[PDB]
Design a protein around this ligand. Structure first.
Ligand SMILES: [Cl-]
Ligand SMILES: [Cl-]
Ligand SMILES: [Cl-]
Ligand SMILES: [Cl-]
Ligand SMILES: [Cl-]
Ligand SMILES: [Cl-]
Ligand SMILES: [Mg+2]
Ligand SMILES: [Mg+2]
Ligand SMILES: [Mg+2]
Ligand SMILES: [Mg+2]
Ligand SMILES: [Mg+2]
Ligand SMILES: [Mg+2]
Ligand SMILES: [Mg+2]
Ligand code: NA
Ligand code: NA
Ligand code: NA
Ligand code: NA
Ligand code: NA
Ligand code: NA
Ligand code: NA
Ligand SMILES: [Sr+2]
Ligand SMILES: [Sr+2]
Ligand SMILES: [Sr+2]
Ligand SMILES: [Sr+2]
Ligand SMILES: [Sr+2]
Ligand SMILES: [Sr+2]
Ligand SMILES: [Sr+2]
Ligand SMILES: [Sr+2]
Ligand SMILES: [Sr+2]
Ligand SMILES: [Sr+2]
Ligand SMILES: [Sr+2]
Lengths: 115, 150, 142
RNA sequence: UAUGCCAGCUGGUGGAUUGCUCGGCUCAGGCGCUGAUGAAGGACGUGCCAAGCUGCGAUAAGCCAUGGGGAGCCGCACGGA
RNA sequence: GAAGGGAGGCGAAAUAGAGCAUGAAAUCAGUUGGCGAUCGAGCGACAGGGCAUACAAGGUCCCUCGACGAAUGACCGACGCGCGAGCGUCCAGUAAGACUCACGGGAAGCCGAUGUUCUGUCGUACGUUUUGAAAAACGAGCCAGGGAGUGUGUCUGCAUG
RNA sequence: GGCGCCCAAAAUGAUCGGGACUCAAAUCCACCACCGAGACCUGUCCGUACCACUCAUACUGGUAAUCGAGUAGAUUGGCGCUCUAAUUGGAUGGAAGUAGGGGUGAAAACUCCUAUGGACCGAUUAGUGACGAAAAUCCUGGCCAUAGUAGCAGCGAUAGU
């Protein structure tokens, strides 16, 4: 039983999208976010660096942390970013919230789920 | 104590009541039962007859061990409660008195309602063998009487 | 010279053919008394239901004659559950403002019992004007 | 219909319940030694009438001084004088 | 009779009159309803009758006929089999068929409900011990009130932040 | 070969459950028709699981021949009690409590009416717990049957009228 109202709306949004638009990643991300917090992702830059490719939004069904180096110009969408992750990322790419990703890409196309 | 458990029209009725009398409650219950309906005058003649040993009081409820009495009608067990009887005569003496002071014909009035109520026991203690002491109490009885014009 | 109950005492709710069907069913079927086992054998044991827990309990083991045991199977129909026997949905009411939003066509009002004569008078008249029946109406001699 | 069974009514018995709190329980802050100049404790006295409590000590519910206080008072304790 | 009782007086109230706010149960007296001196015992549950019922907080219920009509499902008649009891084919998946509704008529102790009692079906408490409890195994006379997973520290999960 | 008969004695009153039964109401061989569960079939509803829609575990629609018993135990939603806070209500035109009665809920329980009472009482949400009893030869208090019963006689002191 999530207690955070925001995480709760974000989930309702992801669903509305996956159902209305051609989403599936969004419904897949909502699925995981509905599971308990220990299962949510905690990803450091190093991993996003190792598997991300330009022109393919990285979607982390959790929170992005700041260990390691990110040089690729990638747009990372996540539930949250640590103050440092958002900073290190903005230097080479763009950090956006899933609320925005669903906004520009309700069809959830050209995306890479990273955990 | 008790309060009259039955309504009584003042213009055609006279009341009386006994309070905390230490006497057999079981006897009271029996005497009441018996005189109910009788005339105050008749009830008094009856109670004097019991006291005298000429009229037995039917013991229908608390009759354990009591021996049969021929003069008892439609029942077998009976006795002659002289103490409780003298107490009802007192009650009746009060009732008829009040009745008269009001201008009624006391004796001629019908015992509309009469009932006894055990108000409590007076604590007593009797020493027994083996170092113990058991209860030895006296029942305390209230009794209500209502005289009604015929 | 005679007593008359204030308000729309005779008003009836308008139910779909189906709600009426189920309402009539609830009323036809009814249900067991569902009192506690053996409550009638010991004064110190009250009627309130307690699941029979004894390992040998006749009722617990379902012996015919020992009384039915509480199961979801006995639940009344959803479409009617909780309706007054008249078919109205009841709405507890504490004051005049509580009458606002109430649909007198399918809902009836029951003024809390704590409410006093002064405030009932206001509530009762205002409810009639809104076409709302009061389940516990004040009777006056008119 | 007796004796009687089950439920209710009226009245008892009983004192649960609800409401009330002069007492507790706990925490916190402050303060902190008394006694041969005979303490603490106890006994016995002490009131118009006085048994208990409280106070007091043959000056005995009190005596004196300074300040406060104030039209009333004679303790708990609503009596009589 | 400084008792108690009756009458009276005060007060909103004495059913506030002295362990004197409220006044439950066990239980007692009187009394009402039902049963009752030819009849049988876990005291009831479910269904159906009798009798009983001021109002309020429930308002339904009965009878004709008609509509709908699941599973199931005929009599009669006709024909054809069987030693016989009886069966087959057609009539016919028709008439009938629980519930529900409509028309017309009716009930106001009348329908529900509550009390009690009668009838039918089932039924030797409850909790515990035990492979096995109605148990000739253990516990309680009855009622009210009281009556059993709590704290600190440490460890290990888990949900949420 | 079939049925039977002898063999064949037990302690309160004989027995196939009983009555009782003889071309049977017995036994055996065939057959005919029926009665009889909660099983199976059928209507409606409930719960649960899964599906579709959905923010929803709220509605609504759909699927279950392949869902529906349960001790110990695991898991989950809910009822009720105290006091705190926030939001918001009721009460002398009568609160709480109690008694009797009506309505709802599978149920824990919620609610209304009448009487009594005569001053306090809730709801929602988040908390807080000395939070729920039929049981422990459980505790304390009160009360009934026992029962108008036993004792009020017995002793080397029979004591009175
Ligand atoms: Cl990582
Ligand atoms: Cl007695
Ligand atoms: Cl449910
Ligand atoms: Cl139907
Ligand atoms: Cl526990
Ligand atoms: Cl529930
Ligand atoms: Mg004798
Ligand atoms: Mg001794
Ligand atoms: Mg009981
Ligand atoms: Mg009192
Ligand atoms: Mg609120
Ligand atoms: Mg308790
Ligand atoms: Mg005896
Ligand atoms: Na005789
Ligand atoms: Na005789
Ligand atoms: Na000090
Ligand atoms: Na045991
Ligand atoms: Na047992
Ligand atoms: Na045995
Ligand atoms: Na005893
Ligand atoms: Sr007797
Ligand atoms: Sr009220
Ligand atoms: Sr008087
Ligand atoms: Sr048909
Ligand atoms: Sr089940
Ligand atoms: Sr089950
Ligand atoms: Sr199962
Ligand atoms: Sr407790
Ligand atoms: Sr006794
Ligand atoms: Sr003698
Ligand atoms: Sr002797």
């Amino acid at each position: 039983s999530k207690t955070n109202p925001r995480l709760s709306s974000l989930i309702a949004d992801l669903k509305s999208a996956a159902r209305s638009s051609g989403g599936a990643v969004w419904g897949d991300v909502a699925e995981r976010l509905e599971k308990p917090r220990r299962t949510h992702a905690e990803v450091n830059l190093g991993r996003i660096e190792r598997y991300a490719q330009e022109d393919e939004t990285v979607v982390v069904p959790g929170k992005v942390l700041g260990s390691g180096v990110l040089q690729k110009d990638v747009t990372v969408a996540a539930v949250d970013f640590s103050g440092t992750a958002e900073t290190k990322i903005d230097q080479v790419g763009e950090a956006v919230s899933l609320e925005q990703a669903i906004e520009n890409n309700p069809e959830g196309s050209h995306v890479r789920v990273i955990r | 104590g008790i309060s009259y458990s039955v309504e009584a029209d003042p213009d055609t009725t006279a009341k009386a009541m006994l309070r905390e009398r230490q006497m057999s409650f079981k006897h009271s219950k029996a005497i009441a039962r018996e005189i109910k309906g009788k005339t105050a005058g008749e009830a008094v003649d009856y109670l004097e007859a019991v006291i005298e040993g000429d009229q037995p009081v039917p013991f229908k409820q608390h009759n354990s061990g009591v021996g049969h009495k021929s003069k008892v009608d439609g029942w077998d067990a009976g006795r002659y409660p002289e103490k409780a009887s003298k107490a009802f005569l007192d009650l009746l003496e009060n009732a008829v008195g009040n009745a008269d002071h009001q201008g009624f014909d006391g004796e001629a009035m019908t015992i509309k309602h009469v009932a006894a109520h055990k108000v409590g026991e007076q604590q007593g203690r009797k020493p027994r063998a083996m170092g113990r002491a058991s209860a030895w109490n006296s029942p305390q009885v209230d009794v209500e009487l209502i005289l009604e014009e015929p | 010279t005679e007593l008359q109950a204030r308000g729309l005492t005779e008003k009836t709710p308008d139910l779909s053919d189906e709600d009426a069907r189920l309402l009539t069913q609830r009323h036809r079927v009814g249900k067991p008394q569902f009192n506690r086992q053996d409550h009638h054998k010991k004064k110190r044991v009250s009627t309130s239901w307690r699941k029979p827990r004894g390992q040998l309990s006749k009722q617990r083991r379902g012996i015919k004659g020992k009384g039915d045991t509480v199961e979801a199977g006995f639940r009344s129909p959803t479409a009617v559950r909780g309706k007054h026997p008249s078919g109205f949905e009841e709405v507890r009411v504490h004051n005049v403002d509580d009458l606002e939003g109430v649909d007198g066509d399918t809902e009836a009002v029951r003024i809390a019992s704590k409410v006093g004569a002064r405030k009932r008078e206001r509530i009762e008249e205002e409810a009639e004007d809104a076409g709302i029946r009061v389940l516990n109406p004040t009777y006056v001699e008119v």
